[PDB]
Tab-separated table of C-alpha atoms in Angstrom:
chain	number	residue	atom	x	y	z
A	1	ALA	CA	29.088	19.125	-6.885
A	2	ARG	CA	26.436	16.467	-6.348
A	3	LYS	CA	25.263	15.774	-2.725
A	4	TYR	CA	25.547	12.358	-1.895
A	5	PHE	CA	22.364	10.373	-1.071
A	6	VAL	CA	22.384	7.331	1.132
A	7	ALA	CA	18.897	5.519	1.541
A	8	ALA	CA	17.658	2.858	3.689
A	9	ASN	CA	14.894	0.588	1.961
A	10	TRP	CA	13.757	-1.565	5.071
A	11	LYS	CA	10.918	-3.130	2.587
A	12	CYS	CA	8.408	-5.232	4.207
A	13	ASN	CA	10.334	-5.675	7.534
A	14	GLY	CA	10.292	-4.452	11.185
A	15	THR	CA	8.437	-4.399	14.362
A	16	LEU	CA	7.771	-1.332	16.914
A	17	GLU	CA	10.451	-2.814	19.167
A	18	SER	CA	13.074	-3.423	16.348
A	19	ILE	CA	12.603	-0.149	15.017
A	20	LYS	CA	13.075	1.601	18.334
A	21	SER	CA	16.219	-0.212	18.577
A	22	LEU	CA	17.485	0.375	15.123
A	23	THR	CA	16.683	4.011	14.935
A	24	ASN	CA	18.433	4.551	18.329
A	25	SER	CA	21.719	3.325	16.663
A	26	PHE	CA	21.241	5.406	13.757
A	27	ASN	CA	20.914	8.392	15.881
A	28	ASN	CA	24.190	7.723	17.472
A	29	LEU	CA	25.913	8.684	14.145
A	30	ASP	CA	26.615	12.427	13.649
A	31	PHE	CA	26.436	14.043	10.285
A	32	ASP	CA	25.459	17.300	8.582
A	33	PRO	CA	22.064	17.045	6.704
A	34	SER	CA	23.207	19.962	4.447
A	35	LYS	CA	26.149	17.964	2.830
A	36	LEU	CA	24.646	14.584	2.931
A	37	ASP	CA	21.022	13.053	2.220
A	38	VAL	CA	20.329	10.120	4.471
A	39	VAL	CA	16.779	8.969	3.789
A	40	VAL	CA	14.952	6.104	5.487
A	41	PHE	CA	11.892	4.297	4.058
A	42	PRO	CA	9.934	2.281	6.655
A	43	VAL	CA	6.692	0.439	5.763
A	44	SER	CA	3.775	2.822	5.663
A	45	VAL	CA	2.073	2.066	8.854
A	46	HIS	CA	5.639	2.451	10.690
A	47	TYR	CA	6.012	5.854	9.076
A	48	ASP	CA	4.832	7.764	12.145
A	49	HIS	CA	6.692	5.786	14.599
A	50	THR	CA	9.963	5.844	12.490
A	51	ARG	CA	9.519	9.786	11.989
A	52	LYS	CA	9.068	10.264	15.620
A	53	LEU	CA	12.134	8.173	16.650
A	54	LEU	CA	14.639	9.336	14.131
A	55	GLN	CA	16.430	12.716	14.629
A	56	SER	CA	15.752	15.584	12.269
A	57	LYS	CA	19.065	15.000	10.444
A	58	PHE	CA	17.380	11.794	8.917
A	59	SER	CA	15.036	12.286	6.070
A	60	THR	CA	12.028	9.854	5.796
A	61	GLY	CA	9.835	8.617	2.902
A	62	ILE	CA	7.268	5.938	1.741
A	63	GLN	CA	8.113	2.786	-0.436
A	64	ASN	CA	5.357	3.294	-3.002
A	65	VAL	CA	2.891	6.240	-4.047
A	66	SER	CA	-0.122	6.009	-5.961
A	67	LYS	CA	-0.523	6.838	-9.700
A	68	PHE	CA	-4.223	8.065	-8.673
A	69	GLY	CA	-5.059	11.114	-6.829
A	70	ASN	CA	-7.598	11.327	-3.912
A	71	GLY	CA	-10.594	9.256	-4.670
A	72	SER	CA	-12.203	5.719	-4.773
A	73	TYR	CA	-8.885	3.759	-4.761
A	74	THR	CA	-9.020	1.161	-1.787
A	75	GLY	CA	-5.517	0.542	-0.378
A	76	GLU	CA	-3.660	3.471	-2.115
A	77	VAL	CA	-1.562	6.474	-0.693
A	78	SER	CA	-2.036	9.472	-2.965
A	79	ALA	CA	0.795	12.076	-3.514
A	80	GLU	CA	-1.577	14.619	-2.035
A	81	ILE	CA	-1.816	12.734	1.217
A	82	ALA	CA	1.784	12.300	1.653
A	83	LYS	CA	2.604	15.914	1.046
A	84	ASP	CA	-0.107	16.900	3.798
A	85	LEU	CA	1.702	14.499	6.051
A	86	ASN	CA	4.933	16.198	5.439
A	87	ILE	CA	6.549	13.054	3.839
A	88	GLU	CA	9.562	14.087	1.943
A	89	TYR	CA	10.420	11.142	-0.380
A	90	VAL	CA	8.568	8.319	-2.475
A	91	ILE	CA	10.384	5.174	-4.045
A	92	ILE	CA	8.720	4.647	-7.484
A	93	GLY	CA	9.418	1.583	-9.841
A	94	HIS	CA	11.092	-0.774	-7.523
A	95	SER	CA	11.877	-4.248	-9.162
A	96	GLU	CA	9.873	-6.011	-6.644
A	97	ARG	CA	6.677	-4.010	-7.470
A	98	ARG	CA	7.569	-4.501	-11.189
A	99	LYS	CA	7.994	-8.152	-10.558
A	100	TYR	CA	5.073	-8.888	-8.275
A	101	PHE	CA	2.645	-6.243	-8.617
A	102	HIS	CA	2.363	-5.584	-12.507
A	103	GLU	CA	3.837	-2.213	-12.000
A	104	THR	CA	4.665	-1.014	-15.650
A	105	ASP	CA	7.022	1.827	-17.147
A	106	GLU	CA	3.696	3.757	-17.675
A	107	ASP	CA	2.815	3.236	-13.787
A	108	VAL	CA	6.114	4.689	-13.069
A	109	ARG	CA	5.554	7.780	-15.207
A	110	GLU	CA	2.126	8.357	-13.704
A	111	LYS	CA	3.373	8.056	-10.260
A	112	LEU	CA	6.306	10.567	-10.934
A	113	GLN	CA	3.936	12.944	-12.398
A	114	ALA	CA	1.579	12.852	-9.397
A	115	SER	CA	4.599	13.020	-6.840
A	116	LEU	CA	6.227	16.236	-8.794
A	117	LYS	CA	2.912	17.931	-8.935
A	118	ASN	CA	2.611	17.654	-5.193
A	119	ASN	CA	6.158	18.761	-4.379
A	120	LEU	CA	7.261	15.259	-3.438
A	121	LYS	CA	10.894	14.107	-4.003
A	122	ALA	CA	10.912	10.734	-6.016
A	123	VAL	CA	13.508	8.059	-5.881
A	124	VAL	CA	12.840	6.385	-9.145
A	125	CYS	CA	14.014	2.520	-9.746
A	126	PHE	CA	15.127	0.930	-12.869
A	127	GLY	CA	17.249	-2.092	-14.120
A	128	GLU	CA	17.709	-5.124	-16.542
A	129	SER	CA	17.209	-8.737	-15.870
A	130	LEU	CA	19.611	-11.720	-16.348
A	131	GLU	CA	18.082	-12.601	-19.787
A	132	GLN	CA	18.257	-8.973	-21.075
A	133	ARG	CA	22.126	-8.744	-20.025
A	134	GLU	CA	22.897	-12.080	-21.652
A	135	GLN	CA	21.121	-10.845	-24.872
A	136	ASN	CA	23.558	-7.879	-24.612
A	137	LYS	CA	20.547	-5.334	-24.165
A	138	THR	CA	21.367	-3.517	-20.905
A	139	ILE	CA	21.477	0.022	-22.439
A	140	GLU	CA	18.454	-0.600	-24.793
A	141	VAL	CA	16.442	-1.739	-21.837
A	142	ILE	CA	17.495	1.197	-19.486
A	143	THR	CA	17.060	3.856	-22.111
A	144	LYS	CA	13.496	2.553	-22.595
A	145	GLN	CA	12.955	2.655	-18.679
A	146	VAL	CA	14.341	5.903	-18.270
A	147	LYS	CA	12.797	7.690	-21.213
A	148	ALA	CA	9.484	6.614	-19.922
A	149	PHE	CA	9.533	9.370	-17.315
A	150	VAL	CA	12.606	11.474	-17.663
A	151	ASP	CA	10.842	14.236	-19.554
A	152	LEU	CA	8.742	15.049	-16.421
A	153	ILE	CA	11.661	16.006	-14.220
A	154	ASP	CA	11.557	19.777	-13.482
A	155	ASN	CA	14.258	19.999	-10.599
A	156	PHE	CA	17.470	17.670	-10.964
A	157	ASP	CA	17.900	17.773	-7.141
A	158	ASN	CA	14.334	16.547	-6.449
A	159	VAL	CA	14.473	13.293	-8.509
A	160	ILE	CA	16.983	10.564	-7.656
A	161	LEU	CA	17.641	7.491	-10.046
A	162	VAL	CA	18.542	4.205	-8.868
A	163	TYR	CA	19.940	1.339	-10.869
A	164	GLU	CA	19.041	-2.230	-9.853
A	165	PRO	CA	21.302	-5.034	-11.314
A	166	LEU	CA	18.524	-7.496	-11.389
A	167	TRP	CA	21.000	-9.671	-13.206
A	168	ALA	CA	23.175	-9.958	-9.974
A	169	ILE	CA	20.198	-10.154	-7.426
A	170	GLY	CA	19.187	-13.859	-6.536
A	171	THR	CA	20.651	-15.089	-9.788
A	172	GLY	CA	23.996	-15.917	-8.178
A	173	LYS	CA	26.238	-13.362	-10.020
A	174	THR	CA	28.078	-10.465	-8.659
A	175	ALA	CA	28.297	-6.921	-9.869
A	176	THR	CA	31.618	-5.158	-9.517
A	177	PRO	CA	31.919	-1.416	-8.635
A	178	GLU	CA	33.467	-0.926	-12.266
A	179	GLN	CA	30.550	-2.794	-14.079
A	180	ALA	CA	28.024	-0.516	-11.943
A	181	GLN	CA	29.864	2.575	-12.959
A	182	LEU	CA	29.640	1.666	-16.847
A	183	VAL	CA	25.935	1.588	-16.590
A	184	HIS	CA	25.928	4.654	-14.321
A	185	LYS	CA	27.908	6.661	-16.835
A	186	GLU	CA	25.288	5.581	-19.518
A	187	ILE	CA	22.425	6.854	-17.158
A	188	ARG	CA	23.871	10.217	-17.029
A	189	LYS	CA	24.384	10.324	-20.892
A	190	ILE	CA	20.766	9.420	-21.402
A	191	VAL	CA	19.751	12.321	-19.105
A	192	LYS	CA	22.406	14.738	-20.853
A	193	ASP	CA	21.103	14.067	-24.299
A	194	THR	CA	17.402	14.403	-23.255
A	195	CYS	CA	17.251	17.143	-20.714
A	196	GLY	CA	20.898	18.802	-21.025
A	197	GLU	CA	24.366	18.943	-19.763
A	198	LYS	CA	24.063	20.734	-16.631
A	199	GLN	CA	20.979	18.650	-15.787
A	200	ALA	CA	22.753	15.542	-15.924
A	201	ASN	CA	25.478	16.690	-13.860
A	202	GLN	CA	23.001	17.723	-11.286
A	203	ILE	CA	21.150	14.524	-10.909
A	204	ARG	CA	21.940	11.750	-8.216
A	205	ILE	CA	22.177	8.170	-9.674
A	206	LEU	CA	22.415	5.438	-7.037
A	207	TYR	CA	23.360	1.926	-7.118
A	208	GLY	CA	20.637	-0.232	-5.923
A	209	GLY	CA	22.320	-3.680	-5.716
A	210	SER	CA	23.569	-5.627	-3.048
A	211	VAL	CA	25.208	-2.930	-0.730
A	212	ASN	CA	27.187	-3.884	2.515
A	213	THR	CA	29.898	-2.621	4.735
A	214	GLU	CA	32.525	-4.263	2.765
A	215	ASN	CA	31.635	-2.935	-0.839
A	216	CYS	CA	30.094	0.458	-0.254
A	217	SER	CA	33.462	2.326	-0.173
A	218	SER	CA	34.487	0.899	-3.449
A	219	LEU	CA	30.931	1.836	-4.883
A	220	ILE	CA	30.777	5.363	-3.761
A	221	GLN	CA	34.395	6.043	-5.146
A	222	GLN	CA	33.151	5.788	-8.765
A	223	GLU	CA	32.685	9.020	-10.462
A	224	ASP	CA	29.009	8.539	-11.462
A	225	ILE	CA	27.779	6.612	-8.199
A	226	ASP	CA	26.323	9.013	-6.006
A	227	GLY	CA	24.994	6.763	-3.320
A	228	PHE	CA	22.888	3.670	-2.698
A	229	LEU	CA	19.620	2.223	-2.158
A	230	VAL	CA	20.503	-0.256	0.421
A	231	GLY	CA	17.958	-3.393	1.301
A	232	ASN	CA	19.176	-6.134	3.749
A	233	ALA	CA	22.250	-4.134	5.230
A	234	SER	CA	19.848	-1.157	6.377
A	235	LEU	CA	17.959	-3.415	8.667
A	236	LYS	CA	21.333	-3.927	10.758
A	237	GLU	CA	22.853	-1.452	13.114
A	238	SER	CA	26.062	-1.298	10.825
A	239	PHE	CA	24.169	0.813	8.282
A	240	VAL	CA	25.900	3.560	10.048
A	241	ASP	CA	29.082	2.448	8.557
A	242	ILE	CA	27.664	2.572	5.038
A	243	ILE	CA	26.808	6.093	5.715
A	244	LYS	CA	30.344	6.688	6.832
A	245	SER	CA	31.602	6.030	3.199
A	246	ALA	CA	29.668	8.848	1.917
A	247	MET	CA	30.868	11.321	4.452
B	1	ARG	CA	-26.232	-11.632	14.549
B	2	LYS	CA	-24.011	-8.700	15.744
B	3	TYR	CA	-24.462	-5.973	13.201
B	4	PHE	CA	-21.182	-4.316	11.623
B	5	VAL	CA	-20.729	-0.814	10.255
B	6	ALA	CA	-17.591	-0.236	8.381
B	7	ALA	CA	-16.097	3.123	7.099
B	8	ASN	CA	-13.834	2.893	3.978
B	9	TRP	CA	-12.239	6.214	3.689
B	10	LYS	CA	-10.465	4.757	0.569
B	11	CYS	CA	-7.847	7.164	-0.881
B	12	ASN	CA	-9.016	10.301	0.972
B	13	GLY	CA	-8.628	12.606	3.860
B	14	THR	CA	-6.022	15.232	5.382
B	15	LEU	CA	-4.824	15.300	8.933
B	16	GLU	CA	-7.139	18.217	9.577
B	17	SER	CA	-10.345	16.649	8.017
B	18	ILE	CA	-9.774	13.492	9.924
B	19	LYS	CA	-9.511	15.154	13.311
B	20	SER	CA	-12.758	17.036	12.494
B	21	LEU	CA	-14.306	13.814	11.182
B	22	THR	CA	-13.159	11.659	14.268
B	23	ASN	CA	-14.287	14.207	16.745
B	24	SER	CA	-17.913	14.218	15.118
B	25	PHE	CA	-17.804	10.347	15.292
B	26	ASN	CA	-16.836	10.339	18.966
B	27	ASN	CA	-19.962	12.289	19.836
B	28	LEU	CA	-22.214	9.126	18.891
B	29	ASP	CA	-22.890	6.917	22.000
B	30	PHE	CA	-22.971	3.240	21.113
B	31	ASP	CA	-22.282	-0.144	22.689
B	32	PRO	CA	-19.425	-1.743	21.051
B	33	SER	CA	-20.571	-4.947	22.553
B	34	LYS	CA	-23.987	-4.761	20.693
B	35	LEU	CA	-22.562	-3.217	17.726
B	36	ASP	CA	-18.991	-3.296	15.548
B	37	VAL	CA	-18.021	-0.016	14.256
B	38	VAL	CA	-14.866	-0.089	12.014
B	39	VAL	CA	-12.834	2.820	10.581
B	40	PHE	CA	-10.713	2.023	7.874
B	41	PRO	CA	-8.078	4.961	6.957
B	42	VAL	CA	-5.226	5.243	4.646
B	43	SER	CA	-2.257	3.315	5.891
B	44	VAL	CA	-0.259	6.481	6.592
B	45	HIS	CA	-3.440	7.849	8.642
B	46	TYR	CA	-3.894	4.831	10.681
B	47	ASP	CA	-1.853	5.960	13.847
B	48	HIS	CA	-3.286	9.514	13.545
B	49	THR	CA	-7.034	7.741	13.229
B	50	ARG	CA	-6.385	5.246	16.036
B	51	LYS	CA	-5.249	7.998	18.614
B	52	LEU	CA	-8.296	10.397	17.857
B	53	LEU	CA	-11.013	7.777	17.719
B	54	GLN	CA	-12.125	6.548	20.911
B	55	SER	CA	-12.042	2.788	21.894
B	56	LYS	CA	-15.525	1.895	20.923
B	57	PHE	CA	-14.637	2.318	17.417
B	58	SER	CA	-12.514	-0.345	15.866
B	59	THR	CA	-9.909	0.312	13.343
B	60	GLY	CA	-8.166	-1.376	10.204
B	61	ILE	CA	-6.230	-1.280	7.200
B	62	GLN	CA	-7.621	-1.082	3.475
B	63	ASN	CA	-5.397	-3.742	2.113
B	64	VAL	CA	-2.971	-6.421	3.450
B	65	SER	CA	0.070	-8.369	1.779
B	66	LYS	CA	-0.214	-11.956	0.638
B	67	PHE	CA	3.487	-12.210	1.279
B	68	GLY	CA	4.990	-12.281	4.886
B	69	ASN	CA	7.951	-10.393	6.020
B	70	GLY	CA	10.805	-9.962	3.551
B	71	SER	CA	11.933	-8.289	0.178
B	72	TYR	CA	8.646	-6.973	-0.893
B	73	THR	CA	8.845	-3.069	-1.200
B	74	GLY	CA	5.620	-1.113	-0.613
B	75	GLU	CA	3.812	-4.270	0.984
B	76	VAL	CA	2.223	-4.229	4.596
B	77	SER	CA	2.527	-7.946	5.810
B	78	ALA	CA	-0.108	-9.482	8.335
B	79	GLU	CA	2.672	-10.030	10.715
B	80	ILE	CA	3.407	-6.284	10.982
B	81	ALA	CA	-0.186	-5.413	11.247
B	82	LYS	CA	-0.456	-7.787	14.351
B	83	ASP	CA	2.455	-6.062	15.998
B	84	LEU	CA	0.728	-2.897	15.669
B	85	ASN	CA	-2.676	-4.542	16.998
B	86	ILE	CA	-4.393	-3.502	13.643
B	87	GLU	CA	-7.622	-5.398	14.309
B	88	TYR	CA	-9.045	-5.520	10.789
B	89	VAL	CA	-8.094	-5.795	7.184
B	90	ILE	CA	-9.980	-5.518	4.180
B	91	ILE	CA	-9.502	-8.018	1.458
B	92	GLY	CA	-10.705	-8.613	-2.179
B	93	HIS	CA	-12.115	-4.916	-2.686
B	94	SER	CA	-13.427	-4.414	-6.330
B	95	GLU	CA	-11.031	-1.403	-6.826
B	96	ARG	CA	-7.945	-3.726	-6.221
B	97	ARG	CA	-9.477	-6.339	-8.417
B	98	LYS	CA	-10.194	-3.736	-10.967
B	99	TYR	CA	-7.063	-1.565	-10.959
B	100	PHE	CA	-4.321	-3.469	-9.209
B	101	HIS	CA	-4.718	-7.107	-10.789
B	102	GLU	CA	-5.896	-8.753	-7.586
B	103	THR	CA	-7.189	-12.279	-8.321
B	104	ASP	CA	-9.358	-14.769	-6.276
B	105	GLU	CA	-5.918	-16.657	-5.413
B	106	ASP	CA	-4.437	-13.404	-4.067
B	107	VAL	CA	-7.555	-13.145	-1.943
B	108	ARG	CA	-7.119	-16.562	-0.790
B	109	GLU	CA	-3.516	-16.179	0.300
B	110	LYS	CA	-4.182	-12.693	1.758
B	111	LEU	CA	-6.976	-14.402	4.153
B	112	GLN	CA	-4.622	-17.317	4.842
B	113	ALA	CA	-1.994	-14.691	6.128
B	114	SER	CA	-4.696	-12.548	8.096
B	115	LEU	CA	-6.031	-15.509	9.897
B	116	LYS	CA	-2.606	-17.115	10.766
B	117	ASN	CA	-1.678	-13.690	12.225
B	118	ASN	CA	-5.073	-13.467	14.256
B	119	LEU	CA	-6.415	-10.482	12.188
B	120	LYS	CA	-10.096	-10.027	11.459
B	121	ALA	CA	-11.033	-9.833	7.806
B	122	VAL	CA	-13.612	-7.864	5.832
B	123	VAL	CA	-13.515	-9.975	2.558
B	124	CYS	CA	-15.092	-8.455	-0.471
B	125	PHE	CA	-16.701	-9.970	-3.749
B	126	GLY	CA	-19.453	-9.178	-6.414
B	127	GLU	CA	-20.349	-9.368	-9.951
B	128	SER	CA	-20.138	-6.906	-13.070
B	129	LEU	CA	-22.915	-5.587	-14.976
B	130	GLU	CA	-21.888	-8.041	-18.006
B	131	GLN	CA	-22.003	-10.968	-15.595
B	132	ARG	CA	-25.395	-9.810	-14.061
B	133	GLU	CA	-26.882	-9.302	-17.661
B	134	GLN	CA	-25.629	-12.972	-18.695
B	135	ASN	CA	-27.677	-13.899	-15.487
B	136	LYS	CA	-24.299	-15.395	-14.009
B	137	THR	CA	-24.629	-13.658	-10.715
B	138	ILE	CA	-24.871	-16.974	-8.425
B	139	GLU	CA	-22.034	-18.627	-10.750
B	140	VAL	CA	-19.574	-15.813	-10.143
B	141	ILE	CA	-20.442	-15.262	-6.329
B	142	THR	CA	-20.278	-18.886	-5.828
B	143	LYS	CA	-16.651	-19.131	-7.479
B	144	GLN	CA	-15.718	-15.936	-5.647
B	145	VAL	CA	-16.618	-17.122	-2.184
B	146	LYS	CA	-15.554	-20.861	-2.619
B	147	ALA	CA	-12.095	-19.419	-3.508
B	148	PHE	CA	-11.540	-18.635	0.165
B	149	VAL	CA	-14.560	-19.742	2.349
B	150	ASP	CA	-12.922	-22.852	3.575
B	151	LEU	CA	-10.087	-20.977	5.505
B	152	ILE	CA	-12.674	-19.714	7.944
B	153	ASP	CA	-12.201	-21.034	11.457
B	154	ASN	CA	-13.908	-18.511	13.377
B	155	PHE	CA	-17.176	-17.042	12.043
B	156	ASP	CA	-17.106	-13.803	14.034
B	157	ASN	CA	-13.690	-12.929	12.722
B	158	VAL	CA	-14.538	-13.086	9.220
B	159	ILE	CA	-17.009	-10.726	7.559
B	160	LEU	CA	-18.156	-10.943	3.954
B	161	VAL	CA	-19.207	-7.859	1.886
B	162	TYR	CA	-21.347	-8.058	-1.181
B	163	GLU	CA	-20.273	-5.352	-4.021
B	164	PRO	CA	-22.919	-5.052	-6.622
B	165	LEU	CA	-20.404	-3.708	-9.211
B	166	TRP	CA	-23.118	-3.514	-11.958
B	167	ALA	CA	-24.843	-0.623	-9.801
B	168	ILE	CA	-21.545	1.067	-9.184
B	169	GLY	CA	-20.476	3.469	-11.864
B	170	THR	CA	-22.725	2.150	-14.372
B	171	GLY	CA	-26.073	4.235	-13.769
B	172	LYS	CA	-28.139	1.232	-12.515
B	173	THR	CA	-29.642	1.170	-9.141
B	174	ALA	CA	-29.584	-1.587	-6.584
B	175	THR	CA	-32.815	-2.173	-4.576
B	176	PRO	CA	-32.849	-3.438	-0.938
B	177	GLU	CA	-34.756	-6.508	-2.302
B	178	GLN	CA	-32.143	-7.394	-4.978
B	179	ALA	CA	-29.448	-6.992	-2.052
B	180	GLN	CA	-31.198	-9.353	0.266
B	181	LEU	CA	-31.678	-11.999	-2.422
B	182	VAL	CA	-28.093	-12.065	-3.087
B	183	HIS	CA	-27.272	-11.950	0.818
B	184	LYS	CA	-29.448	-14.888	1.089
B	185	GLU	CA	-27.684	-16.875	-1.577
B	186	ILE	CA	-24.225	-16.102	-0.131
B	187	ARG	CA	-25.181	-17.480	3.214
B	188	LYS	CA	-26.717	-20.543	1.426
B	189	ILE	CA	-23.074	-20.927	-0.251
B	190	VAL	CA	-21.600	-20.732	3.399
B	191	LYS	CA	-24.115	-23.118	4.540
B	192	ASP	CA	-23.399	-25.837	2.126
B	193	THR	CA	-19.510	-25.447	2.431
B	194	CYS	CA	-19.180	-24.629	6.157
B	195	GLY	CA	-22.421	-25.495	7.845
B	196	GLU	CA	-25.590	-24.580	9.253
B	197	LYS	CA	-24.503	-22.903	12.654
B	198	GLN	CA	-21.613	-21.141	10.765
B	199	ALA	CA	-23.733	-19.263	8.162
B	200	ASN	CA	-26.251	-18.183	10.835
B	201	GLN	CA	-23.087	-16.737	12.525
B	202	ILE	CA	-21.155	-15.036	9.778
B	203	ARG	CA	-21.964	-11.144	8.952
B	204	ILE	CA	-22.792	-10.260	5.244
B	205	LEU	CA	-22.658	-6.780	4.582
B	206	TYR	CA	-23.939	-4.645	1.600
B	207	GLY	CA	-20.981	-2.881	-0.101
B	208	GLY	CA	-23.020	-0.874	-2.660
B	209	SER	CA	-23.857	2.861	-2.455
B	210	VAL	CA	-25.075	3.385	1.170
B	211	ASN	CA	-26.328	6.706	2.496
B	212	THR	CA	-28.499	8.108	5.202
B	213	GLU	CA	-31.579	7.470	3.295
B	214	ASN	CA	-31.197	3.971	1.998
B	215	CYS	CA	-29.446	2.382	4.985
B	216	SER	CA	-32.451	1.470	7.015
B	217	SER	CA	-34.216	-0.105	4.024
B	218	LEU	CA	-31.135	-2.340	3.618
B	219	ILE	CA	-30.354	-3.207	7.166
B	220	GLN	CA	-34.038	-4.228	7.969
B	221	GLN	CA	-33.478	-7.029	5.455
B	222	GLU	CA	-33.007	-10.310	7.165
B	223	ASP	CA	-29.724	-11.387	5.568
B	224	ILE	CA	-27.844	-7.967	5.446
B	225	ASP	CA	-25.783	-7.471	8.777
B	226	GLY	CA	-24.398	-3.963	7.974
B	227	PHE	CA	-22.527	-2.057	5.510
B	228	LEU	CA	-19.196	-1.256	3.920
B	229	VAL	CA	-19.618	2.580	3.463
B	230	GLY	CA	-17.830	4.511	0.925
B	231	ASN	CA	-18.220	8.129	0.380
B	232	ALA	CA	-20.913	8.790	2.954
B	233	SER	CA	-18.326	7.682	5.442
B	234	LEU	CA	-16.410	10.960	4.835
B	235	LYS	CA	-19.051	12.785	5.980
B	236	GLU	CA	-20.392	13.899	9.885
B	237	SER	CA	-23.753	12.278	8.806
B	238	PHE	CA	-22.130	8.791	8.908
B	239	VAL	CA	-23.303	8.550	12.379
B	240	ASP	CA	-26.881	8.467	11.304
B	241	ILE	CA	-26.072	5.330	9.328
B	242	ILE	CA	-24.648	3.729	12.347
B	243	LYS	CA	-27.792	4.757	14.233
B	244	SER	CA	-29.740	2.648	11.690
B	245	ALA	CA	-27.926	-0.337	12.884
B	246	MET	CA	-28.533	0.606	16.533
């Protein structure tokens, strides 16, 4: 069976005091890290602070990793550097980086190759916009997005996929647990037909839309949804209840 | 003017190499009131580097977000840097202009955010080989500087860096005399836009290839007030470069 994966994407948020208060509440929740992956993604400069405050049961990672190795690349964090610091996870291809920072499908591929070459576990994001879904091209876009990097996957416990319904984020539309499941089933079929049936049943596929304390249990209930990449709700203390649904 | 020597470690370093490198840096005795020395480690190394370096050394980060706090995955805001007492930020580095789509407007917005949050900024600019061969050095630098220069309210807190991109990775050399004439022109740009006393106050650093041999010939020039050092800042011999500014 697939080990459930609950991830906190703090994005560009937090202070030293707020993280101190939030990580304390997180630590009050008791769980087994061998049956459940719970990962926190703070700002890079908050990593050391966050890793020191969170108990060993919690996994940690960074929100981006360089497509370049060590060298003359100002502002970059290489996969080499991350591994030396024992950073376990990286987020690759988040919609906000594709939208605001020119991150292409090829950047996503180069980042994944760098991460897996350096023994990093990768959380890889993808999803279609509103205009793409209205043109009935949901599967076509996601297939193009997944096939950009899927051949690089050597271990299917170490690569975690995240579907982002960009058609239901900021647009004013809602994505039901059923509508997410239908895409998740397609993603697993894409993995199956390109990598194998056993590999597709190994790989975790998360829902990376608006997840809160109310809908998390109805989302995790679906057969092909193995967890979430949580945004705004992971900045609140009630994030422990979202972890409770996958327990 | 107070001299300013900066170590841009770029995308380099391990935990062990940094503790070895910082220890050798700690060996050098200088007065931080007479000379600014700033180390810019990778973001995930910042806390490690700050703990190991003695308080005489200033520290900073190699990039800062144009956005404030919010839904911007992978970004470090100026607000977050201020809360961590990160003193300095690098803005407009050629490598981020080249590989990461960073434009003059991004630089402006980054300087806007940094100054609002009481951060000190090391702002980079410079022309390509094509631009120099077309004799457009002054035109390009005027536009690059005028993109942000009006935002400076404190001329000790904003530091300019000239990167001669025509000399980096091409096979052509930049002389201290060539660097001086550009630095003089940059100061003339600041004078026309901000004032005479302000241009006399602002530090302008050479951001090309600096090592233990050329540093003293560069810093002796009247309009070059220090360096942004790349590769040579990764060696223990970086102390000799700091010594040339002493």
